[PDB]
Ligand binder design. Structure first.
Ligand SMILES: O=C(O)CNC(=O)C(=O)O
Ligand SMILES: [Mg+2]
Ligand code: NI
Ligand SMILES: [Zn+2]
Length: 331
């Protein structure tokens, strides 16, 4: 069995290997990359996502989210307070202000220490989940707005034609902006490209050990667990590496820099934080290997997780028993 310790693998495809996205994902899995839950892909040196980022400041962040924490430094939840709209140029200036800027630090490890020590005492503002793309239309390789759609994958594998669409999302981050522990909707893959700016640190649990993380989360967030049998779908809970180590939960960590792709694999729980002002683009995708994960994915029916139009069909076709209850949650 390849990669039996479930280490995060890093790939350096050549320009020729970067042509066929599906084939390269299948290659990485042949080497065991999925066992970690997360892989890094460094694009060939010839490739670029677009020519420059000099003209992005007029993108609108219609609903910036202030991420307010509650709990203790290593075990906390965050809620998202909606703020007034601002442009990317306004948000960059805000990120760079004395109130929000990255503190002086020695290296990524020192910054990581400072994040876990101090995150809860601040409320950084995240421009998350903005439909759109920064890939140039002429970028033909690994262009996250030109991928094969999940609806077309389900149709190719299972024969059933369904409604729905699959488009990318932009994320504008600042120091301490945080993504809570989660798997993707319907335990899909994700791909994330860091277009510009400061790094993003990731934590990930191997898919084969995801239920260990769930059990810990039920112990650490006991009211939330009674409220919902899949409350990590709410995407609000954080658990530090120190706490994970104290409770024996297998995980790994890596830092993504500008110009790098990350892939998350089905049922790979992940969480992380931004080091400073940055912009990422991410989208869900599927392969044939996902279908079995999609059929088994948990679901939130308490009403909190509220998701896209396109997840309806996935539930309806892959999980017809759960459909009725899940749709009640959505309505
Ligand atoms: O970058 C972020 O804030 C969160 N991204 C993801 O969870 C992802 O790409 O799957
Ligand atoms: Mg602009
Ligand atoms: Ni994710
Ligand atoms: Zn729920």
């Amino acid at each position: 069995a390849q990669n039996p310790n479930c280490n995060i693998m890093i790939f350096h495809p050549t320009k020729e290997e970067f042509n066929d996205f599906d084939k390269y994902i299948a290659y990485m899995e042949s080497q065991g990359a999925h066992r970690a839950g997360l892989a890094k892909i460094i694009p060939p040196k010839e490739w670029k996502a677009r020519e420059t980022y000099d003209n992005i400041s007029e993108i609108l962040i219609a609903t910036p989210l202030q991420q307010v924490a509650s709990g203790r430094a290593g075990v906390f939840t965050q809620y998202h307070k909606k703020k007034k709209a601002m442009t990317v140029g306004e948000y960059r200036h805000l990120a760079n202000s004395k109130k929000y800027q990255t503190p002086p630090h020695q290296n990524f490890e020192d910054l990581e220490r400072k994040y876990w020590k101090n995150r809860i005492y601040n409320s950084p503002i995240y421009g998350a989940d903005i439909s759109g793309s920064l890939f140039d239309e002429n970028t033909k390789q690994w262009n996250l707005g030109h991928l094969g759609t999940i609806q077309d994958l389900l149709e190719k594998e299972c024969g059933v034609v369904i409604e729905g669409v699959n488009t990318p999302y932009l994320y504008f981050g600042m120091w301490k902006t945080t993504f809570a522990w989660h798997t993707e909707d319907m335990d899909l893959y994700s791909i994330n490209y860091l277009h510009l700016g400061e790094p993003k640190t990731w934590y990930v649990v191997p898919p084969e050990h995801g239920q260990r993380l769930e059990r810990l989360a039920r112990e650490l967030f006991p009211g939330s667990s009674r409220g919902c049998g899949a409350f990590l779908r709410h995407k609000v809970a954080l658990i530090s590496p120190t706490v994970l180590k104290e409770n024996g939960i297998p995980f790994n960590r890596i830092t993504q820099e500008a110009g790098e792709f990350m892939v998350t694999f089905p049922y790979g729980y992940h969480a992380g934080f931004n080091h400073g002002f940055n912009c990422a683009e991410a989208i869900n995708f599927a392969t044939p290997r996902w279908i079995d994960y999609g059929k088994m994915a948990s679901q939130c029916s308490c009403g909190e997780a509220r998701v896209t139009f396109s997840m309806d069909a996935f539930v309806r076709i892959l999980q017809p028993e759960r459909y009725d209850l899940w749709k009640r949650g959505q309505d």
